[PDB]
Structure 1
Amino acid sequence: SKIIFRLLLNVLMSIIAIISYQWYEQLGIHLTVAPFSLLGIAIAIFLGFRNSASYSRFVEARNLWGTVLIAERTLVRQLRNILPAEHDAHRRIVSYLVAFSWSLKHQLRKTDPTADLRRLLPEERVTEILASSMPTNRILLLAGNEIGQLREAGKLSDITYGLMDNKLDELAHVLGGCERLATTPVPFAYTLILQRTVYLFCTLLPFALVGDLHYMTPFVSVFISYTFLSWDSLAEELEDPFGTAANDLPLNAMCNTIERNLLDMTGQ
């Protein structure tokens, strides 16, 4: 937590306020608590709404990934319930569904999905997927072809084909949703306004408290600053849900969970 640096900086500003409080009158500068209460409350209100937006975004990201697991579970269930004897098809479709999850992760992380794809799919399909400017989307197309062939071969009717196609649609909404969350952030002018106001507020605060608090200034000023900064920093942690950091989504573990689930449901 690099929050400690500005807390330390805040302690230093408090010490300056205490020793420089002498020259306050000799300059004509006074700072009371009342105007900073107004400012502080206004900032708290705006921080509240902002964090709310950051929170909703983090939650949606969690929701989208939850849907991958749900839709892939049911698609495999449908394949077993409707075509219990078609395990060759079971394995092929499962490999694509598993590939989709990993490919989505790599896409959001901007990493190379090549190794994971080669572990799951024949090289012909991997080349075919990587040739696309939108590889994760290309993967859905391939899963659709597998289902499409079962339809053409008469193993799936249009009805049962439709039941499985619906699940691919659910995955498509996940892909677009994540892509939307990745390119659209909470707008950058929310963060600038708040960062500029919060930092300036905390550093000016001890100068406004010193008249009332004297020697207790650094303790109370640090308490108030810590409160605003903790709340402000919470938004920063929630804003990067697809990242690698510790408070980011465990996408690797999630992908492993998805793969473990699908191989549990096909006897592998």
Structure 2
Amino acid sequence: SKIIFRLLLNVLMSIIAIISYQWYEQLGIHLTVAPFSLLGIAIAIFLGFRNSASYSRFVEARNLWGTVLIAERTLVRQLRNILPAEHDAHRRIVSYLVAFSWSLKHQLRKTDPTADLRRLLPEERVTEILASSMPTNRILLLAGNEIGQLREAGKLSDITYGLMDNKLDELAHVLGGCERLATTPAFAYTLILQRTVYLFCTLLPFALVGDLHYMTPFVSVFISYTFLSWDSLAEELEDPFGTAANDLPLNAMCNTIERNLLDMTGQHP
């Protein structure tokens, strides 16, 4: 958030514009507003569409995480409703579902899931999970064996197994959607558009000065602020899985998921 830096440099560029207006018609240099109107409206259009895309990715990310909570709540719901007495199963599945959420956070944050895993699962499971090119996937497989074994033992039918299998499928879709949003970056343009906006804002006073004279800085900074604010919104929407204040609060969301699942299985945080 060196937007305040970019403003100050604008005020500076404005002063340089006023000062150097003295030599403007002489060097053979004239700068009108109308060409900058054209360019500025074009950039605003492009910024409008770009931000629209950024916003949508951020919302999709928030939604995918939304689905983790919904699908996990419902899997636990089904286990209790279908197998009310299998409390061991209840607890092991819950510990996989909770491990899934934390490991999803670690995967997207590019951090180590070991501590969280060790808190939740026996060490043999941790080892098996850590060895996988995709830990969240191994957890889904392991949650799968729990309902799998219940099915082998005749406690679930093929139908009731399928109802719960569908929830693991839904979690696979969340996993896939997040990995798609993480490793998605023509982000190359987000930077190009940014430099465009920067260059435009810094050239702008030079074009305004002929008309506004001493008023240049105020108008220049006002227009710069509007474009720079809008442009920086994109930047803040473009790393939804990051650690910045305006990124998704994944730690808090994992705590909510865990709290919900412990609540449903009669445990106290």
Could you report, residue by residue, the CA deviation over 1:79-119 in whole angstroms, capped at 9, with x for unpaired residues?
00000011010000000000000000011111111111111
- Once the two structures are TM-superposed, the CA of residue 196 in structure 1 deviates from its matched residue by 2.2
Deviations 1:99-153 (A, max 9, x none): 0000000111111111111111111111111111111100000000000000000
Aligned counterparts of 1:242 and 1:6: Cα–Cα separation in 2: 26
Alignment correspondent of 1:126: 126
Q: How far is 1:193 from its partner?
A: 2.6
Deviation of 1:168 after TM superposition, in Å, equals 0.1
Percent identity over the alignment is 100
Q: How many residues align?
A: 267
Cα RMSD after superposing both structures: 0.8
C-alpha separation between the residues in 2 aligned to 1:25 and 1:266? 79
Q: Residue 59 of structure 1 aligns with which residue? A: 59
Q: Tell me whether 1:149 sits opposite 2:145 in the alignment.
A: no
1:171 Cα offset (Å): 0.2
Q: Which runs of 5+ in 2 are unaligned?
A: none
Structure 1 segment 157-168 matched on structure 2, within 5 A? 157-168=157-168
What residue number does 2:87 align with? 87
Alignment pair present for 1:201 and 2:200: yes
Q: Which region of structure 1 is more displaced relative to structure 2, 177-186 or 163-172? A: 177-186
* Distance in 1 separating the partners of 2:88 and 2:77: 15
The answer to whether residue 162 in structure 2 is matched with residue 183 in structure 1 is no
Using the TM superposition, give the Cα deviation of residue 189 of structure 1 relative to its aligned residue in structure 2, in angstroms.
3.0
- Whether the aligned pair in 2 keeps the contact of 1:129 and 1:138 (CA below 8 Å) is yes
CA distance in 2, matches of 1:244, 1:16: 38
Shift in Å, 1:20: 1.0
Separation in 2 of the partners of 1:26 and 1:60? 55
Whole-angstrom distance in 1 between the partners of 2:74 and 2:194:
45
| Structure 1 consecutive aligned stretches of length 4 or more whose deviation exceeds 3 Å | none
Aligned position for 1:258: 257
Superposed displacement of residue 192, structure 1: 3.0
| 1:24 aligns to 2:24 (yes or no) | yes
Query: Is the 8 Å Cα contact of residues 50 and 190 (structure 1) preserved in structure 2?
Result: no
Using the TM superposition, give the Cα deviation of residue 19 of structure 1 relative to its aligned residue in structure 2, in angstroms: 1.3
Alpha-carbon deviation of 1:217?
0.6
CA distance in 1, matches of 2:110, 2:9: 36
Q: CA deviation at 1:178?
A: 0.5
- Once residues 127 and 251 of structure 1 are traced to their aligned partners in structure 2, the CA distance between those partners, rounded to angstroms, is 24
**Quick check: 1:238–1:248 contact (8 Å CA) kept in 2?**
yes
TM-score, normalised to structure 2, is 0.98
Q: Tell me the CA shift for residue 195 of structure 1.
A: 1.5
Give the CA deviation at 1:206. 0.3
